[PDB]
Amino acid sequence: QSFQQPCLGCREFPASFELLEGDVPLSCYAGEKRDLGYMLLDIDFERDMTPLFFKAVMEDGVITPPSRTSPEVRA
RNA sequence: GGAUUGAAACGCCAUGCUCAGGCUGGCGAGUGCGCGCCACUCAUCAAG
């Protein structure tokens, strides 16, 4: 169930979803560290919709962004 | 139930491969070559 069909970015790309109740499956990038550069965390809507960015590293295929509510990522 | 740099977003309108042009003119299967040389139907059996 859902309020609306989720989409992968743009509405024309529907996202099939499913709750995961166990260990995450294996990633194709399991043994690799990859740097993706700075990308978007979220839009700080409270601060007149100021975007904020973080540098994305993709060790083992898992990205760990900082909490967008943290004071040290926000303006 | 506020926000997935999102929410909205046609490649779309239309356009003869056509007009046409012998595969033709002509060329003996032909000259010739015994099925032939031989070989008993035959040795018997009343008519009732």
Side-chain angles (χ1 to χ4, degrees), chain A residues 42-57:
Chain A
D42 209 350
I43 282 78
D44 199 11
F45 286 96
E46 282 70 19
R47 276 64 168 292
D48 59 275
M49 310 167 164
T50 296
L52 26 75
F53 302 90
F54 80 117
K55 86 174 324 312
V57 187

Side-chain angles (χ1 to χ4, degrees), chain A residues 3-31:
Chain A
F3 184 80
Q4 59 177 310
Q5 184 62 27
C7 61
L8 303 159
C10 304
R11 272 238 282 193
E12 59 261 35
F13 308 132
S16 300
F17 66 99
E18 139 186 316
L19 188 74
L20 189 66
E21 296 278 33
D23 61 359
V24 300
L26 207 41
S27 310
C28 293
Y29 304 91

